[PDB]
């Protein structure tokens, strides 16, 4: 049985995979991590005890029958009541996370991907360094809490500019309503005069590389799905003084494909969402690999890639 | 240069390791994780440019000169002012953590221990499973949010009882700012009638094994320092079978340091409890049995292997 580690509000990727798994003659159990412990019962035995078992209403999954694990979405304990004490709620979340992580890490069979591999590939500074050691171009990157280094960094890349971004995912719910998020943003001359807040939280700054194309590369095992989109606000080839777009298939150079495969092999991954950009002079710059990045918007929308089939195959075929 | 990843309020283990490193003709930089970003400056470069530098007052460290890393204490940014907005503070703590973790993971040289190894050995359920696969006795354990499975677990071990414990480390601060902590605690029959709170947080229950001694085992490389106390620590000689099994457990997780807890029954049965990759050791060095552990850590940090 394929154990699918997700949450209740996950998107259409889950039913796409379970049906492709079910259509191959195998079965799959959906484990919504956010509905634990409030609704889902998990029993984890260590020793010569009874078998570990996950119970979700009528559904029941014995952990000895797990042949594969899809390490998809991890939202441990989100459905804990809001009216709970904040000290007990934060402590309960950390206990739930350690519990379910220990369950997954103890299960045998095929993992997509193992926790130790996803954890090790989540260091974005290590991603760029390993990609560069493999011969891939990476943008100039500085994570810093030091204004003098940041000023020096923005100055040497003044012609094209620099952006900033956070290494973490989070949101600030301010005032009375909305959620606020730090997207990758250009830093301005005015932002450079207000660098005093770096002593309370560092940021990651990157060389802003002008790009002709954005590449979205999804790898399943050794199968490479490459999609490109023209993001040029001013496209030179089409420019006309007298006078939409969508994602389309793209053929990577076999050298880039073999380098991305070595990147997957180094971290031990069999799934990965890789971001690259292509300059007008056809230089390929590696940006980021997300071991749990999305893929559904490349399958349900152009170029309608059949990734969910490839994932279900490697899950039920192991290797 | 040995990078030492600790924090400002960490105990007297750091200076002794430092002096032992310095007395061996090498250099050592102390990096207090809690004093970043408010005081310590870190600059992590990726790309064709540099690697990075850590600046702390007059002291600076070029990450190119890092020959080894002691992954000791990780209190990322706990010296943030408490007058800060709580939403911004927790977001800053999460950003500071990912920044320094990526710094450590990217560094080459000898790590004691690597992050990926420590994160993998942190699964206590995996510790008991691998210890059992190597031939070590482990107490019957149940992690659960299910009262029915817990009641059966307590009836199963009704003769000796069961204890409960939390997998996580935390502390609840009451109204008087007093510090509350969940130690390993017995489970009474009154507790078994109030299991409804398991739907809000699971717990880890274990067979209460009656014991004669409690063993504190500290391993540096392949050197084993065993202490025993009656439940004033004393030396203790493990059977070689137990020592080799613990060495195989460390080699599986890829650790060269570990704090291992065991108990011995009156009939001399050795039960494996836990391995903490960053567990303390100083109290076994400054107090009986005065194990020279800080010397063994400094020697493995300088001599690589």
């Amino acid at each position: 049985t394929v154990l699918i580690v997700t949450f209740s509000r996950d998107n259409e990727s889950i039913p796409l995979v379970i049906k492709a798994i079910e259509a191959m003659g195998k079965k799959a159990f959906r484990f919504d991590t956010d509905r634990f412990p409030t609704e889902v019962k998990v029993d984890l035995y260590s020793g010569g005890q009874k078998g570990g078992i996950i119970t979700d209403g009528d559904q029941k999954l014995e952990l000895k029958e797990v042949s594969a694990v899809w390490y998809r979405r991890m939202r441990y304990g989100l459905k804990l009541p809001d009216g709970m004490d904040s000290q007990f709620r934060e402590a309960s979340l950390k206990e739930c996370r350690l519990s379910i992580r220990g369950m997954i890490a103890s299960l045998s069979g095929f993992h997509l991907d193992p926790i130790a591999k996803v954890d090790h590939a989540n260091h974005k500074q290590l991603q760029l360094q390993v990609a560069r050691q493999l011969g891939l171009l990476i943008p100039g990157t500085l994570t810093s809490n030091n204004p003098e280094a940041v000023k020096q960094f923005a100055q040497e890349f003044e012609a094209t500019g620099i952006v900033t971004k956070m290494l973490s995912q989070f949101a600030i719910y301010g005032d009375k309503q909305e959620e606020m998020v730090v997207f990758t943003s250009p830093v301005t001359k005015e932002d450079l005069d207000n660098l005093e807040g770096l002593q309370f939280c560092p940021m990651t700054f990157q060389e802003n590389i002008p790009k002709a194309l954005e590449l979205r590369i999804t790898i399943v095992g050794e199968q490479i799905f490459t999609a490109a989109i023209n993001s040029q606000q001013l496209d030179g080839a089409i420019y006309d003084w007298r006078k939409h777009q969508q994602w389309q298939p793209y053929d990577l150079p076999k050298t880039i494909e073999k380098q991305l495969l070595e990147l997957m092999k180094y971290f031990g991954l069999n799934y990965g969402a890789i971001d690259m950009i292509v300059t007008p002079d056809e230089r390929y710059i590696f940006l980021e690999i997300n071991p749990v990045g999305e893929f559904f918007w490349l399958e349900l929308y152009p170029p309608y890639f059949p990734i969910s089939q490839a994932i279900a195959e490697i899950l039920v075929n192991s290797a | 240069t040995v990078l030492i990843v600790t924090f400002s309020r960490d105990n007297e283990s750091i200076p002794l390791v430092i002096k032992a490193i310095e007395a061996m003709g090498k250099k050592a930089f102390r990096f207090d994780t809690d004093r970043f970003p408010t005081e310590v400056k870190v600059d992590l470069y990726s790309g064709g440019q540099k690697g990075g530098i850590i600046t702390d007052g007059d002291q600076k460290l070029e990450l190119k000169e890092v020959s080894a890393v002691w992954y000791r204490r990780m209190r990322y940014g706990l010296k943030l002012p408490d007058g800060m907005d709580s939403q911004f503070r927790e977001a800053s703590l999460k950003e500071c953590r990912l920044s320094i973790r990526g710094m450590i993971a990217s560094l080459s040289g000898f790590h004691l221990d690597p992050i990926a190894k420590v994160d993998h050995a942190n699964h206590k359920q995996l510790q008991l499973q691998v210890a059992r696969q190597l031939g070590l006795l482990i107490p019957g354990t149940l992690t659960s949010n299910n009262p029915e499975a817990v009641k059966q677990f307590a009836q199963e071990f009704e003769a000796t009882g069961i204890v409960t414990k939390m997998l996580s480390q935390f502390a609840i601060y009451g109204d008087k700012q007093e510090e509350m902590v969940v130690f390993t605690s017995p489970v009474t029959k009154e507790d078994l009638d109030n299991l409804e709170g398991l739907q809000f947080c699971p717990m880890t229950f274990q067979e209460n094994i009656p014991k004669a001694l409690e063993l504190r085992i500290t391993i540096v490389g392949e050197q084993i320092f065993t202490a025993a106390i009656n439940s004033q620590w004393q030396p203790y000689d493990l059977p070689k079978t137990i020592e080799k099994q613990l060495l195989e457990l460390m080699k599986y997780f890829g650790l060269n340091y570990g704090a291992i807890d065991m108990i011995v029954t009156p009939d001399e049965r050795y039960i494996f409890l836990e391995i903490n990759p960053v567990g303390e050791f100083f109290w076994l060095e400054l107090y009986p049995p005065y194990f020279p552990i800080s010397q063994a850590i400094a020697e493995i940090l300088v001599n690589s292997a």
Partner: peptide, 12 residues
């Protein structure tokens, strides 16, 4: 709305 581990909180 209390979790089960609240019953075992001691004083450090």
């Amino acid at each position: 709305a209390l979790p089960f581990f609240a019953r075992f909180l001691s004083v450090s």
